[PDB]
Amino acid sequence: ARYIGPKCKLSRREGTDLQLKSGVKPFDVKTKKANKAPGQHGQARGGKQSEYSLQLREKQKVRRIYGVLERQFSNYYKEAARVKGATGENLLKLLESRLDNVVYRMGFGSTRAEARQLVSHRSITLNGRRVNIASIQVKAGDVIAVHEGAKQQLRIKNAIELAAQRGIPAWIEVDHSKLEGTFKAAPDRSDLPAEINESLIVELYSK
Amino acid sequence: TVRTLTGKVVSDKMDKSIVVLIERRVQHPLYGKSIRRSTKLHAHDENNVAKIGDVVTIKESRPISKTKAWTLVEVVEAA
Amino acid sequence: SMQDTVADMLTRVRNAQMAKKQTVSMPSSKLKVAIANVLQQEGYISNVEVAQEETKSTLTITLKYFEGKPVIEMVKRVSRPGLRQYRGKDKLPSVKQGLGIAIVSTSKGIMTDRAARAAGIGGEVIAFVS
Amino acid sequence: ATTNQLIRKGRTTLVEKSKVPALKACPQRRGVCTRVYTTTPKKPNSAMRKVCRVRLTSGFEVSSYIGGEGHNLQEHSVVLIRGGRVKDLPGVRYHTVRGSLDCAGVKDRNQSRSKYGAKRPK
Amino acid sequence: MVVIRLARGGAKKRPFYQIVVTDSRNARDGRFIERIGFFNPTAQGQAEKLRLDADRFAHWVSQGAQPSERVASLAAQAKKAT
Amino acid sequence: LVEKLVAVDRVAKVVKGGRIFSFTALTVVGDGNGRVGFGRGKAREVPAAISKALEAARRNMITVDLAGTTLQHPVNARHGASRVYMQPASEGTGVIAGGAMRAVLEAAGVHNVLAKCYGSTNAANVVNATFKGLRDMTSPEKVAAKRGKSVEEIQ
RNA sequence: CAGAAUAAGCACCGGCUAACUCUGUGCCAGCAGCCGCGGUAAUACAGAGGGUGCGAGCGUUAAUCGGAUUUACUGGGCGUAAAGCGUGCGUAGGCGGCUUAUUAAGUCGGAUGUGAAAUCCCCGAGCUUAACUUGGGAAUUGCAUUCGAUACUGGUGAGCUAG
RNA sequence: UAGUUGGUGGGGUAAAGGCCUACCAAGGCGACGAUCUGUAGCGGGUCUGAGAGGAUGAUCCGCCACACUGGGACUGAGACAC
């Protein structure tokens, strides 16, 4: 199962832009109701929260951008705790290693939902083979190319020109002419945005 | 190459048979204190040399009777 | 009646330190002298002396105070006559994460747990000192 | 205790009794309704609460609460009972499952329907 | 008698055999004397297809063990390969 | 200077013709790098009690020597009927403790530790026991100085 | 090849515990794991709006361990909270002063044999991924035999006087 | 506890053995729990627990026992035989 429904109330509850829309218009012009919770009893951002509320609200925000549900997220945490290293760093590496996210960051999809649809509809090839699972883990030195029938899609060309506005990350090199790209290694924490706090998730799941 | 036990005789009434008491010291599995345990073993003594109170050695052998499977080797100390 | 002379010696040292005496004296024995020698070598006490009148032997120990507190802040008897404690070479206890010493009697004499691990032997655990 | 005392006599554990003996370690039981009636709550509560004395296949006769507002139970009905105390009613340690065998689901209910056993309205 | 044969394991439609020396009266996937190799009829990629301990095989044959047809064919093929 | 409010309770005193209600507050202040203290305050209103408790906490302070972000060695402490056990942990563990211990430990600047309460869980007594244990924790340099040895000799 | 075309529910929103208002009823109907709600403004009953948590599942009941240091070996107590026999003597048992020689039972160390496979853990391999299957290790904290050590406990011989 | 505990002669078994038999003797077990009585297939393992422990013995593997209820033997290398 994948979440379907309204994305702007989703972002409004967390109070921050979750990048769930293409971005042709800024978030503030898009919703006009930011810093207001979706409910009628919705209030400003300054509402006091308990620690349990803060940890939960952070984990939900982390889940909502990547579109992962609770079972898979708990499995991700349990694997990251087993793997040696920083638990939050490992969890971020696992979340950023999914095939759909790599397709999105390579610029073949306007949004992560578009990337998921493209991957699921067998429009992507991994190392020369057409796959259809969004949660396939991408390893170092991989090659992701757009399938031949998938090429010449107006949505894909719009996605690549939109991605041109943002910056192509370091670990991904893309030939946009050939619709091809190469994942090299998992981003370190510095590459990812620093507003995300992972410690809250850590004690929330280690309670 | 044969299993031997050393003990003290506690009975000699039976004909060609003696009863020897074996003692061992082990640790209690849970509380750790050293405990002493005792076992009474019937042995074969053909010539009735042993008597009550001597220290004897016995060795494992084939069955001789219903309850005897050990045979006397030597008398270490006399009473 | 008195049945644990080592425990008596440790209790005497503890009470003397708590009362802030300078020296402590007791009837002597070779085991007590051996334990006091280890304590002096490790630096918890200053001087160990033995006197002999005719057959009685008296053991005297000079105590150490640094700043206001006594040097020996904790001394515990581990093995006791009602429960003997024996440890292998790989299960020797550590006291205060290595900042204290466990006194161990091994087949090569009385030493600390550190020296016992260095020599790769076990034995009886007499006391913890810190 | 001393070590010798522990060796001679070890520590003793006291067994625990279940709070639902009539179920005999089963999730539910089936019974035949012996007497349906109403009772009054213990202080400081005041109401008229619907209960029924039921004889179970376990060989026991107990009392069970009826939840929800409006029931069609009567003499000799066959019902399923589960665990759960009513607190303010002394002696009633069981509940009747709504809509299982002869009991029917409550009417005109649209929230918490899985409890009380009401189907989805069309 | 004593035989050398295949015991089945693995998953449905993907068999994986252990090569075992055992008394013939024992159940196929039960009690055995000694395991001396494995066979994977559907190996792919880097997976090995057949490991057999030739010295143990010869030692047990010298004592009167009877290989099955499949095991004899596999032993011949392994000897041919190496 | 980080400040934490552990508990707030309402108390009553009986007089003729009614009762007088008051409020008590327990707070813990710290610098996050080995300085920590705690205090109590009583008032008619909650903010006044919090202010008095904070002032008392700032007045009652000690210095705690840490090993990086964790304890030097296991600690057992007690105050009245409350007993506490604290143990050092490796990096990435976090602070595994109850709220009363968590406040004091985080104010004192410990990042990885495992802690356990036994006996009574009264907040003031637990804070007292944890404070005593942190005060009485020792260090290799102090041990070497007191025994007249070297740090490498002490190990 | 066809065309969004065939495909979302369940629990909860006084505190413990993330998520609030309005109508209907008035110690009635009813809710309730504990503390407790309802006797005309019910954020706790029923409906509705809104929201929160999960999601092809969601809730309830039953059962085991945990939290429970609440049988306490690790790791509890007995003046007043539960708990010192009314007071002695004494059998089995438990424990026992100092020095010395010897023994090697307890205790410690080495070697050898054994401790089936599967299972748990680690590094890999094959399943589009994962579950799953599988190669090799580590482990199996034990037992037995044999060779060594003698500080402590035990046995034996001798000696001493603080009990 | 009176074939009960030990011994001798004899019988019997694939094989040691009161396994059986005739005599001789009075031994044997027990507070380290005999006898009686309730409950129960055992292990590798599984669940939980920081650990020590506690609960458990479906599915997989090893051992044991049973085949409507009791008592027997035959054939056979092997059964007291679903």
From Swiss-Prot, chain A:
InterPro entries: Ribosomal_uS4, Ribosomal_uS4_bac-type, Ribosomal_uS4_CS, Ribosomal_uS4_N, S4_RNA-bd, S4_RNA-bd_sf. Belongs to the universal ribosomal protein uS4 family. GO terms for molecular function: rRNA binding; structural constituent of ribosome. One of the primary rRNA binding proteins, it binds directly to 16S rRNA where it nucleates assembly of the body of the 30S subunit. With S5 and S12 plays an important role in translational accuracy. Disulfide bonds: none annotated. SMART domains: Ribosomal_S4 (SM01390), S4 (SM00363). GO terms for biological process: ribosomal small subunit biogenesis; translation. It holds the Pfam family Ribosomal_S4. Keywords: Ribonucleoprotein, Ribosomal protein, RNA-binding, rRNA-binding. The gene is rpsD. Part of the 30S ribosomal subunit. Contacts protein S5. The interaction surface between S4 and S5 is involved in control of translational fidelity. Residues 23-51 are annotated as: Disordered. Residues 97-159 form the S4 RNA-binding domain. One of its GO terms (cellular component) is small ribosomal subunit. This is Small ribosomal subunit protein uS4.
From Swiss-Prot, chain B:
Keywords: Ribonucleoprotein, Ribosomal protein, RNA-binding, rRNA-binding. One of its GO terms (cellular component) is cytosolic small ribosomal subunit. Gene3D superfamilies: Nucleic acid-binding proteins (2.40.50.140). The keyword Protein transport does not apply. Pfam families: Ribosomal_S17 (PF00366). One of its GO terms (biological process) is translation. GO terms for molecular function: rRNA binding; structural constituent of ribosome. InterPro entries: NA-bd_OB-fold (IPR012340), Ribosomal_uS17 (IPR000266), Ribosomal_uS17_bact/chlr (IPR019984), Ribosomal_uS17_CS (IPR019979). The keyword Transmembrane does not apply. Part of the 30S ribosomal subunit. Belongs to the universal ribosomal protein uS17 family. One of the primary rRNA binding proteins, it binds specifically to the 5'-end of 16S ribosomal RNA. This is Small ribosomal subunit protein uS17. It comes from Acinetobacter baumannii (strain AB0057).
From Swiss-Prot, chain D:
Keywords: Methylation, Ribonucleoprotein, Ribosomal protein, RNA-binding, rRNA-binding, tRNA-binding. GO terms for molecular function: rRNA binding; structural constituent of ribosome; tRNA binding. Part of the 30S ribosomal subunit. Contacts proteins S8 and S17. May interact with IF1 in the 30S initiation complex. This is Small ribosomal subunit protein uS12. Belongs to the universal ribosomal protein uS12 family. The modification 3-methylthioaspartic acid is found at D88. InterPro entries: NA-bd_OB-fold, Ribosomal_uS12, Ribosomal_uS12_bac. It comes from the Bacteria. With S4 and S5 plays an important role in translational accuracy. Interacts with and stabilizes bases of the 16S rRNA that are involved in tRNA selection in the A site and with the mRNA backbone. Located at the interface of the 30S and 50S subunits, it traverses the body of the 30S subunit contacting proteins on the other side and probably holding the rRNA structure together. The combined cluster of proteins S8, S12 and S17 appears to hold together the shoulder and platform of the 30S subunit. Pfam families: Ribosom_S12_S23. PANTHER family: 30S RIBOSOMAL PROTEIN S12 FAMILY MEMBER. CDD domains: Ribosomal_S12. The keyword Nucleotide-binding does not apply. GO terms for cellular component: small ribosomal subunit. SUPFAM superfamilies: Nucleic acid-binding proteins. GO terms for biological process: translation.
UniProtKB/Swiss-Prot annotation, chain F:
The keyword rRNA-binding applies. Keywords: Ribonucleoprotein, Ribosomal protein, RNA-binding, rRNA-binding. Disulfide bonds: none annotated. GO terms for biological process: translation. Gene3D superfamilies: 3.30.160.20, 3.30.230.10. One of its GO terms (cellular component) is small ribosomal subunit. Part of the 30S ribosomal subunit. Contacts proteins S4 and S8. This is Small ribosomal subunit protein uS5. It comes from Acinetobacter baumannii (strain AB0057).
